[PDB]
Design a protein around this ligand. Structure first.
Ligand code: H07
Lengths: 150, 627
């Protein structure tokens, strides 16, 4: 059993990544109201705790942080302000879990569209790092592989 | 051979059956079927011939009795208001939809040429042989363009289609029989609720008018008058269900109100003339904390960088563009203002001109600012945003846990009932796509945060350790009573307030708490377990009877993932499967409110909370209470 958490600001692609990993957009209908909605077997079972849709409810991310074992800090390369928002979420994990180090992955979503990029690759590596895309299936599975290793 | 095929089922010989079967292997419409089915069909397929082109096989609206296969010739598919929509040729089959779904004929079948031969299977023979094995899909085409897709999920249900065809389908299949009242309304509910996404009133109302006046092109004078009457009856039924969904929200829609006005006159004029609609006419006549409307006007304060403000008078559903305009009108501007939300914590969000009804989307202590873009980074929060500096224990400590929880639940229910089902739809699909407010949902969702931060505020403002232990005990008690009233929302809000980093830190306070309440809380916190899609909560809420308030953040999550996880359109057709899923979630809210729920000072406190929502301040306060 493993519990992984997806974090980030609104309009970043959190829900798109979650669905695209557990099942897949279009190929099958997505029911988020059943027991195995966010669970996928890879040989071990993973549960994705995504904060998408519940960002205004701070208690929701805190609950997911306490129960989480791996963390995915996601931002958009088309949105300048979204990379800035990651510093707070980073420190909040160490605060809720009350630990020195936490297994986490840094994710730069929406890497498929370059003609709208305002956030270069530069900034990511300095703070593992991936440039992924949910709608283009780039590095979707890879994100959640790192966390199980860590 | 055709004489053989003219013989009734129980009159064909063994050699007759054996020779018919041999020929059925050449018919393409039957080739996917088993030998078992084909052998049974050999004793059931009736041969039918008609001489003249233009002969009507059956009318749209008639009850279905037979399934047909074309041996020779061709037919036209005729729908009222559209004419010839499709042509069928040698090898093709039709008339299965009415038989399987127990619905009226969706179209008329008219002979296209002279001398057409058919194979026919009657109703009861079709049901025992073909119904269970026929096919999973029916694709309806009009002008060689995909228009409706029906599948087995047992009947063929709508999976996808054009807005016009989906409307046509749900209009046609309405059952007027009084004993089928709830079944009819239940079937229509998905369309009536979800039409705002794929067929707004601007398109729906003219389509409704056109359907109401659409006369039949086939049949005797009596058959035609009977169909048109029943057509009109079904349109009225749909209109009534449509109007009921909106309720008071019709006042926000000029097109919808103008439609109803003229529709009522049309129906009443037809009622007088035809002596009909005796039950439905008075129903239509009736239609022709309190919930906030989009048209309501608010006095709202928009702040300048120097912390002065303008008071604007605008509608609740006003766009940011309209807000900017109202501010500019008072300050006399031409300096390129932008609207920005600011937290008590100082973090800022720039709003697009596109955004509608933003007033209620603010955080508990959020404020709205108007400034040129170069001022964005220099903006700083107001003192008013930073919350109280002295607690209110001396007031609510004198109040009972049961009294507080009850007044909380009463207030919560007033806020919950103010939320219209459609606000859930507008919130999910994007507020700007409808130009409608979600103010009521906005305020009820914020209430979750208000209760959560109330707990943290009072604990962090309580300097005495002994009194602080008393607070923890009281909050656990209030939470327990909230769960008793089936107010799960406020229950989780208190539990999560206790879970907050600033409160859980207080080891000396938790340690000194009686083990009776320590285990009580651990049981509460275990209900929050996110495991197996919040299974612990899911089962808890399912066992309860239907006067309850659900865990709202999870509902919003369900709605979000239903939207992002599914495409609204597939191949330019409306994905009605998705629409059905959204409607199911909304109906769950309808189920929770389907039953009613059963001390001015206690009422006053609960409804007028002053809260710190600045997490930094709360942590700093907690760090000096217990270093
Ligand atoms: C499945 O057969 C359909 C209808 O079934 P029914 O029993 O409602 O009677 C009219 C029949 O015409 C056929 N039909 C057709 S032709 C057809 C289409 C699909 C199949 Cl599997 C068989 C025939 N096109 C239609 C349309 N655009 N709207 C409504 N009905 C259409």
């Amino acid at each position: 059993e493993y519990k992984l958490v997806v974090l980030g600001s609104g309009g970043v692609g959190k829900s798109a990544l979650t669905v695209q990993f557990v099942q897949g957009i279009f190929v099958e209908k997505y029911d988020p109201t059943i027991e195995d909605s966010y669970r996928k077997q890879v040989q071990c079972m993973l549960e994705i705790l995504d904060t998408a849709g519940t960002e205004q409810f701070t208690a929701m991310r805190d609950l997911y942080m306490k129960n989480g074992q791996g963390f995915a800090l996601v931002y958009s390369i088309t949105a300048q302000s979204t990379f800035n928002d990651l510093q707070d979420l980073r420190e909040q994990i160490l605060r809720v879990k009350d630990t020195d180090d936490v297994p986490m992955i840094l994710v730069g979503n929406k890497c498929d569209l370059e003609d709208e990029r305002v956030v270069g690759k530069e900034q990511g590596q300095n703070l593992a790092f991936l440039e992924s895309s949910a709608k283009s299936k780039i590095n979707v599975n890879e994100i959640f592989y790192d966390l199980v290793r860590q | 051979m055709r004489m053989i095929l003219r013989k009734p089922p129980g009159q064909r010989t063994v050699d007759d059956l054996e020779i018919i079967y041999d020929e059925l292997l050449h018919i393409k419409a039957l080739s996917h079927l088993s030998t078992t089915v084909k052998r049974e069909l050999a004793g059931v397929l009736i041969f039918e011939s008609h001489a003249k082109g233009g002969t009507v096989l059956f009318n749209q609206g008639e009850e279905g009795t037979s399934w047909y296969i074309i041996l020779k010739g061709s037919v036209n598919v005729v729908i009222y208001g559209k004419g010839v929509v499709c042509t069928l040729h040698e090898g093709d089959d039709f008339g299965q939809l009415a038989l399987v779904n127990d619905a009226p004929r969706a179209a008329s079948i008219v002979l296209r040429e002279d001398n057409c031969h058919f194979l026919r299977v009657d109703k009861e023979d079709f049901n025992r042989i073909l119904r269970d094995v026929e096919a999973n899909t029916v694709r309806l085409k009009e002008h060689d363009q995909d228009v409706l897709v029906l599948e087995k999920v047992q009947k063929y249900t709508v999976m996808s289609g054009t807005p016009e065809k989906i409307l046509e389908h749900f209009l046609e299949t309405i059952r007027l029989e009084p004993s089928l009242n709830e079944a009819t309304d239940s079937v229509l509910n998905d369309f009536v609720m979800m039409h705002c996404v794929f067929m707004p009133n601007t398109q729906l109302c003219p389509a409704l008018v056109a359907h109401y006046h659409a006369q039949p092109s086939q049949g005797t004078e009596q058959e035609r008058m009977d169909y048109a009457l029943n057509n009109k009856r079904r349109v009225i039924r749909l209109v009534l269900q449509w109007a009921a969904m909106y309720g008071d929200l019709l006042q926000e829609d000029d097109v919808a109100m103008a439609f109803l006005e003229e529709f009522y006159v049309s129906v009443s004029d037809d009622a007088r003339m035809m002596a009909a609609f005796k039950e439905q006419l008075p129903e239509l006549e009736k239609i022709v904390r309190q919930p906030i409307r989009g048209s309501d006007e608010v006095l709202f304060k928009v702040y300048c960088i120097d912390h002065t403000y303008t008071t604007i008078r605008v509608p609740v559903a006003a766009s940011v563009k309209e807000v900017i305009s109202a501010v500019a009108d008072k300050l006399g501007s031409g300096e390129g203002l932008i609207i920005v939300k600011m937290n008590s914590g100082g973090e800022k969000v720039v709003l697009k001109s596109n955004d509608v009804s933003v007033f209620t989307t603010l955080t508990i202590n959020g404020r709205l600012f108007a400034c040129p873009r170069e001022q964005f980074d220099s903006l700083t929060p107001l003192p008013e945003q930073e919350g109280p500096t002295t607690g209110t224990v001396g007031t609510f400590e004198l109040m009972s846990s049961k009294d507080l929880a009850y007044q909380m639940t009463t207030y919560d229910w007033e806020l919950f009932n103010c939320v219209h089902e459609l606000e859930l739809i507008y919130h999910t699909f994007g507020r700007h796509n409808f130009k409608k407010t979600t103010a009521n949902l906005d305020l009820f969702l914020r209430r979750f945060n208000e209760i959560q931060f109330w707990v943290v505020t009072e604990v962090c403002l309580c300097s005495q350790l002994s009194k602080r232990v008393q607070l923890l005990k009281k909050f656990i008690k209030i939470a327990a009573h909230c769960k008793e009233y089936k107010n799960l929302n406020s229950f989780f809000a208190i539990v999560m307030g206790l879970s907050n980093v600033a409160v859980s830190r207080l080891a000396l306070t938790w340690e000194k708490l009686p083990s009776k309440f320590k285990k009580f809380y651990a049981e509460f916190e275990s209900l929050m377990d996110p495991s197996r899609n919040h299974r612990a909560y899911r089962l808890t809420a399912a066992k309860l009877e239907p006067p309850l308030i659900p865990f709202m953040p999870l509902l919003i999550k369900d709605m979000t993932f239903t939207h992002e996880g599914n495409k609204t359109f597939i191949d330019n057709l409306v994905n009605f499967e998705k629409m059905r899923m959204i409607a199911n979630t909304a109906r769950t809210v309808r189920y929770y409110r389907s039953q009613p729920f059963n001390h001015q000072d206690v009422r006053s406190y609960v409804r007028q909370l002053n809260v710190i929502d600045n997490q930094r301040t709360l942590s700093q306060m907690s760090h000096r209470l217990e270093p």
